[PDB]
Amino acid sequence: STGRFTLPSEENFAEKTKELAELWGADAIRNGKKIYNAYFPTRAHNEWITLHMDETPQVYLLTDRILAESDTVDIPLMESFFAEQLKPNRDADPHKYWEVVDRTTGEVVDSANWTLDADEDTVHVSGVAAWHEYTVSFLAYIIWDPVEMYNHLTNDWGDKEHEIPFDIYHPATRKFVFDTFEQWLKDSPQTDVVRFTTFFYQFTLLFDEKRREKVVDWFGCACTVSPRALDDFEAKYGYRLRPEDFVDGGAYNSAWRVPRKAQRDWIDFLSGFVRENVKQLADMSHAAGKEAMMFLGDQWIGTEPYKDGFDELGLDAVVGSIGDGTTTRMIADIPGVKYTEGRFLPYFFPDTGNDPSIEGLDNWRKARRAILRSPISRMGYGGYLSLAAKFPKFVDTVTHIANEFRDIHDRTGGVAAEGELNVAILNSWGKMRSWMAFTVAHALPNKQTYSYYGILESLSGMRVNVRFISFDDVLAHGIDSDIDVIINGGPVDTAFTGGDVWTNPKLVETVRAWVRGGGAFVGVGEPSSAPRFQTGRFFQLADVIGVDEERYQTLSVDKYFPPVVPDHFITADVPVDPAAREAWEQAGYRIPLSGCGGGQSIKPLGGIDFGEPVLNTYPVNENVTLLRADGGQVQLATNDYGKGRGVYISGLPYSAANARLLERVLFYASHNEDKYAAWSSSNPECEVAHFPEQGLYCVINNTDQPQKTTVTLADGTTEDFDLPDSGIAWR
Template identity: 50%
Template sequence: MKKTAGRVTLPSQQNFLKETKELMKRWGADAIRDSDGTKLDQEIKQLDAKIYTTYFVARNHNDFAIKHPEERQQIYLMSQYNTATSTTIEIDFLKGYFTEQMEPDYIHDPKVWWEVIDRTTGEVVSPDHWSVNQTANTLTITETKQWHEYTVSFLAYMKWDPTHMYNHITNDWGDTPHDIPFDVRQPHANKYVKEYLRKWLKDNPETDVVRFTTFFYHFTLIFNHLGKEKFVDWFGYGASVSVAALEAFEKEKGYRLRPEDIVDEGYYNSTFRVPSQAYLDYLDFIQQFVAKEVKELVDIVHEHDKEAMMFLGDNWIGTEPYGKYFKHIGIDAVVGSVGDGTTLRIISDIPGVKYTEGRFLPYFFPDTFYEGNDPVIEANENWLTARRAFMRKPLDRIGYGGYLSLAYKFPKFVDYVEKVTDEFRDIYNKINGIKPYTGLKVAILNAWGKLRTWQTHIVAHGKWYKQAYSYHGVLESLSGSAVDVSFISFDEVINNGIPKDIDVIINAGDAGTAFSGGVWWKNEKLTTILREWVYNGGGFIGIGDPSAYHYQGRFYQLANVLGVDKELGFSLSTNKYFTEAKEAHFIAADVTNFDFGESMENVYVLTENTEIIEYSNGGVHLSSSSFGKGRGIYIAGLPYSHENTRLLLRAMYYAAHKEKEMKKWFASNVHCEVHAYPEINKYAIINNSTERQVTDVYDGAGKKHNVTLEASEILWEDYSHEG
């Protein structure tokens, strides 16, 4: 592979000039950045490279925050459940929380802004029946009902930015002052951030790219009393709440939010929850405010002839890249952490920016770079999973973060990254701006729609929960598959119908979640639209607990489409006779071992017309059913793997009645894939594994040939036919 340069961002630090120059040359870096906890000295800033400078808008300004404690960021928290054993109960509402991060808000009247709830009945307790001891941080309720449970929803001020806290604890920063987050909605803070940015830009002429990390409100990250993560929601808007915001919301929307609209029974409106209308209204309200304020900052950066880059993490809340207002911000670039193919597509698919950049793992921190550990293992896994998605929609740049001096101590890692950066540029130079071949148009149906394009339950630093959640497995498989993927919401289907170009709709997730749909499936218009669409030839794939909502004798509301339903224990007296699986089926042709992950149990066939593909342990885990001219496919679970990616691909083609088209561009070996680019008459055969693979390759014209690929190899071939 030819040695190339450019499109790579290198983290550096003080007193590391010689090594920085060496790695710039080896990795082909054309940009240098600082990180949280590092700074660039003047010699490094004079190197022939773009200089990215991390910029914090609403943290790392303690001089201001200490002067205006009333303008610190706020959050609604809920106490633990407390059982009343008498007619009076005293609640330690801070119990379980990290007091170095939070303190109760006593500046604003608790009787107005707090809420006490009888969780046994759901009734709100009158403020006349409770009082707060501000010295002891306790709340006493009188006239309680014995053996009922009670909670307190209280406003708190945040004293420590969560990301700074994480980095501080991870790197043992000792007595380094805690970054205090403040709220730009407040008058002094709003004025300060704009004046400070103008001054900072004048004082930092060597900065080419202002890397906003990020803007105003951190995703919800709450620590427990041990200083460990208690609640993490990368999509959580909890830290955007304030008395000022609640008052402005009431004025704009015409009604007042309750604390319960935010704490949500202690679930804090996590991404898994089907969002309430009040919460959706609040998201829209915050997004409008953030977009307006961010645009002002971006305009200031542009006035100083510098680029504005947004880090898709930390304080990103409100800057939804797939939301209604992002296009008005005017940001030049977005950079985010890449943990796998799905996280890569979150970034690379973002519309309306000049370029996108991925920060690859591992982060150069001591939790990975320590004696005895091999960071190449994580780096290789990270690159191979992300590379599949890269072949569909490449990032414009890649980079790393953390302490470069740590990475430099691991020569094998340095060698590996040199190979990755060269391979990245080689792929990019071939396919950037080129539309890859897609055999199907697939829509993911959930409660969030395009707002959560490629997004499920991402957590801090770009890593995903490793449990075999069906929804993430589906997205990860799709992120590098040769299909066109879109995201639609239940509301869109009800109001606008199903787009005419959709071949297959996928509904995946656990029952009751936003991804499966929960109460949405009670809507008769939704179910009738989907049934009609499948009956007329559409393909529907349900994974996990699709269309799940117990209503009118059905658990799966599209049971007639899927050909299966789930036994909840209510119909055990009704015999189920259909248990025999087919010996062979198109969908399972490449599977040697079924893996449904956490799976679903007690799913049974409705009629003999359903094709059972896998049946074990008293339940169906894979099946297909005809419904009119269309098909419904059921899969009990789909953790990401090469075999499951192939199973899903086959299921999609089968659901769409396009089985014969699947092998237009195709590799027989499940560890390999073919990506074709008709505009440039090239196709790539990639080995997604770390072992040598042999595969038959179908080249788009019905021709088959055999190829051997070394571990992780990409083989590029030209072709002259139309494909």
């Protein structure tokens, strides 16, 4: 049990620093061991940026919609934005760089028809149509670094000076940053690892007039424009971006949107620029005898750790924030670095009286099921070490975790567990957004995302191989012959279902043919959906999965539901209260009634949490197998399709039960039922990792209980376990 652990520094508590590093087998100290220093290339020099204020990052902002009540309207620029963070750019010619849109028609208002007030941040529009809504899209300087701003507001730093951010796209600021880092390196001989936190462009993070978050996209590049960059883009790509190409009608190019060419063009542009400079920073670091480590977050926009070429940056490490299985996978699967690191929870900060061991062991549980599938090299925590030395139950929690971690490494050699199936998530983005589907705010699923995010989180720690593919991959090269299951999920008209790509007959031909020949297709929520393309067919692959969504176009056609099959391989681990099942059996099915179809269960069978409902799903014919069809619509179904199978699930919030459901779905759909038993846990609360090349397996408790489970080995025999609080057994 040696090393692989990163411990954060403390102001003066330099006494227990030697004792806790010895107790935890620590080999690195954050901020005779390895030393990490956080570097912040775009802030922490107000002495520079105040003298060149037009070199701050900038962003297109969309004003509120203003109603015109005659042929003129006044549109205030800053009324809905935090004036401490953002300020309208009056230097760059508004009539050149801004755009007033009539949102009612979609037409751009002619620049002869509007002016910027000389003394107020107000736009005067004349010659317009009464009773239309009008917005301005304008450039704004970001005069306060979004993350430092966030920490300021969160910790209430009061009147502490606001860090002004700068943009290395301007040659003067770029020269300053490199000169400074050179000097910094010279002045930092003790530092072993430069922890870049992060680089050049903050992810979209804008605040409103009430000091609240207004707009956030962990992947967003709102905060990446300036007049020079926009003009250079035109010179390089051969057309001019509209402000609309960034404000996106109010959507701000959310990753949920079906990606437009303009967005891809901008990503490529930004990425060439960011990557060359990151490499320069890594080179300088290495030339000084130091390692370069990137933080996966904050100013990470334009790095693209999952695009090809990332390796050529020559970064030594990626370090990332661990909130769960999915966010662990984001870090763990990154190619082209020497090692990876997770900053585990809880952070060492007062708001975590309480038993802090619980969060720490829990954060470790969501992460460890993922680490088993895709190991991370190192672990650690941030913050105030004095604040946690005070909690003796927690210190012992960490000693255990650091040792379990290394024991895992020492048993497995950092090798990943064996995957029993090959699963592909199919969406508009593919590999570049590996493990990043459905995310808005990092680690914060919500009402609108959690029914889909649950898919990734289920997969993150599952005994299968997961890969991320795009509709472009499938159209150019077909479906790789080693894939067992394809998954398509999300709401209609998103990047994650795909939108109008589904009206492209080549795509449909390719998937249909592959499933007919024995492939497996799993649709979640509104899979393969295309609005208005066919009057009687919303899910374009409805025939594959046996389920469509009624969109109020087909109410005249009676829908007939076949009887639900309660005893089935897929649902075999769902406990049902006998009295629930009894009620469901007793009430029976609806009798055909004019205009109402028939066969829908009068009472629900239940037992399963499906998240957000997809209303009026129905079976396409009576040969589709219904597994849950409660409340007059369909939540779970399966269909045979030539040699292959399609499955529908309306939604899938993460839980052990739901992860087991999905796993069973994956083995069933790819006709691999008899392959399921080997290396399985009978208890859904527990999970098995098989390491054949080492002749070993482990079984883990996903919880802080005692859990009883039977593991089935490949040779048919069974081994029983009684697992203590988040335990781990090895055979």
